[PDB]
Amino acid sequence: DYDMAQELARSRFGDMILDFDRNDKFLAGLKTTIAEKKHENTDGKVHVLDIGTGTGLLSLMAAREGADKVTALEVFKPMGDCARHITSNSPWSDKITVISERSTDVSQIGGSRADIIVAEVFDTELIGEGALRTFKEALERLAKPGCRVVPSTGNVYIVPVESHLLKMFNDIPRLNGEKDEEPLGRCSGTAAVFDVQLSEMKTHEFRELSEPIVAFKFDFEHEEKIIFDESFVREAVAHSSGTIDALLMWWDIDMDRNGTTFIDMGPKWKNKNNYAWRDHWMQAVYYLPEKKKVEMNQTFEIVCNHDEFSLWFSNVGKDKSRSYCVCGLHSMLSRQTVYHVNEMFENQKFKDEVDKLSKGLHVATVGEGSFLGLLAAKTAKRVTIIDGNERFRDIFFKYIHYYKLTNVEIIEKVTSLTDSPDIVLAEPFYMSAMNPWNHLRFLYDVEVLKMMHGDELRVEPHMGVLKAIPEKFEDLQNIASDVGTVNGFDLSFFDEISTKARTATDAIVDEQSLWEYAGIVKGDAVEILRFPIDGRVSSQKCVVNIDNMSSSNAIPMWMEWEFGGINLSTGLLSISSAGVPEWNKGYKQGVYFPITALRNDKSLCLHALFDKSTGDINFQFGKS
C-alpha cells in the first residue's frame, strides 16, 4: 500500500514526460522505423513493442504514426493500469494492448513478434535501469529477425578535467591543507553514482585536459553485441598538462541508426547544437582510485569498466574491478556533505571565528557528523565532541590520532558531559537532516545541556532563522508541474493519480541542490521564523505573504545561523545585481513549487508551524 503509492509518486521521473526534445526524438526514431517497415513488410503491417510504457505516451505516438499493432509492457502495476486507461480512452484503443509484465518475463507477445522495439529505459548512467538485458532478451525472444530498435545505438563519453570544485566532492578533508595529509588512509571513493547538472559549472571552475573520449559504444539492435561485463583500455591525447581531478561522463543515443538524430546528454558548454535542459537525465562525475597526472601532447590511457548496471574507471596496471569506500566517509556522507566539510576546512573567516571563540576554553560540540570540534582543537584547552553515531565517532577517533589532537575527547550522549564546559559550539550540523531545518535537533541538545549545566551556558550559534525567497527558475519548476496534454495526447489521468500519490506519500516542500539550477530571484529574502537559543524549545507558527509570485515559479527556503560575529547560511550566499542568487553547494535547499491551483497568483500565503513535539516544520501554501 504505502510502498506501492510512493513509487506511483516517483513514476513521472521529474520532467521526463515534459522533456520536449526526448519526446521529439523518439517520435522521429519511430517515424523512420515504421516507414522502413511500411515498405518492407509485404502486407504493410507493422507491429511495435514499446517496453517500459509508463503513461503509454510512446505507444500512442507509434499507433498515431500508423503502426498496425502496438504492444506496450509496464512492470509497475499501477502505471500499467494508468496506461491501459489512457490508451483505451483514446482514438487508438483498438491498436494498442497493455500487458503489465516486465519484458524479461514475457515469453511470447502473440501471435507475431515485433518488427520494431521502442524503449525509453535509460538513466543518467545509461545502463543503470536494465537497458542492457531489456534489449538483449527482447531481441532473443520477442522480435523478428532484422527487428529495428529505437534508439538503435548509444555512446558513453568521459572527459578528464582539473577542478578544485569537483575535488571538494571527493577528497578526504585535510585539517591542515597540505597533502600528504591522509587522516583516513587512501580511498577510492564509492561506486555510488554522482549525478550533476554539469552545465552549471562556471568555466573557471574546471579545465578540460582532453577531447571527450568514447568509453563505450553500445548497439541495441544485435543480441550478441550486448555483453554485460566489459573492460577496455582507451587512449587520448592531452591538450593540457594538469591533474585528472575528475572524469565528466554523459551519453548520447542515435534514435534510428542514421548518424543524424540524437538524444545528446552533453553539457551546455559541450553540445553546441543538440542541447536541451532536463532533469530526469543529467551528467555524472566519476573519480580515479589514485592520482593521475597528464602532460600535453602526451598520450594517456583510461581503463573503462562496466558491469550490468554500473560504470567505473581505473588506471592502467592498477587492478580492474569495482572499488568501494574503505575509509567509511564516502559511504556515510552524501556528496554535498563532503563538499561541506572540505569547504569548512578551507574557510579562513570561519576558522578565525572558531579560534576566537575556543581560545583557552573547554568547548563541547554537538551535531552528528559535524567536524567542527577538530577545528576547535587548534585553540581550545579541551574539546568534548558529542556524537551519537558510532561510525562518526570512529572517524573522529582516526583524525584525533592522526593529527595528535590529545586535547580532544569523543563521547556518545549529551547526558554524559558531566563536566560543565565553558562554551558549546555547533554549526549546527546533523547528518540525519533531510531539510535545512532538521538541523533544529540542535535546539534540543541545547535544552538538555542548559538543564544540566546552567541557563547562562554560552552557546554559538545564538540565533537561527528560516528564510524564503521568490525565484523564477529557468527550468527546474518542470520537475513538479502537471503534465496535462503532451504530443496531442491527454495525460491528465496520470496527473490525477500522480497528484493523489504525491499528496499522500510526499513532502509539500522539495529538497534540491539549487546551485545546479539557474534562475533569477524576484524579491528580497524574507524571514519566516527566528529561533533563539533558549532554556526551553517552543513551538512557533507564522503566516507571511510572499509577493512577486506572479513572475516567479518557486520559493527556495533555507536556514541562516549567527555563529559568534559571523553569519552561516545553508542556502543563499549572495544575489548578483542582475538578480542571480548564489547557493551554498554543501547543502540541499528546500524549494516549494506552487501547486497548479496557484500557478497564477501575484502573492501566496506561506504558513509554517515549527512543532516542538516533532522537531519539525510544517508548511502550507495558499490563499492571500
Ligand SMILES: Nc1ncnc2c1ncn2[C@@H]1O[C@H](CSCC[C@H](N)C(=O)O)[C@@H](O)[C@H]1O
Ligand atoms: N524491462 C522492462 N519491462 C517493462 N517495464 C519496464 C522495464 N524496464 C523498466 N520498466 C518500466 O518502464 C519505465 C521507464 S520510464 C519511460 C516511460 C515511457 N516509455 C515514456 O517514455 O514516457 C518505468 O515505468 C519502469 O517501470
Ligand SMILES: [Zn+2]
Ligand atoms: Zn572512502
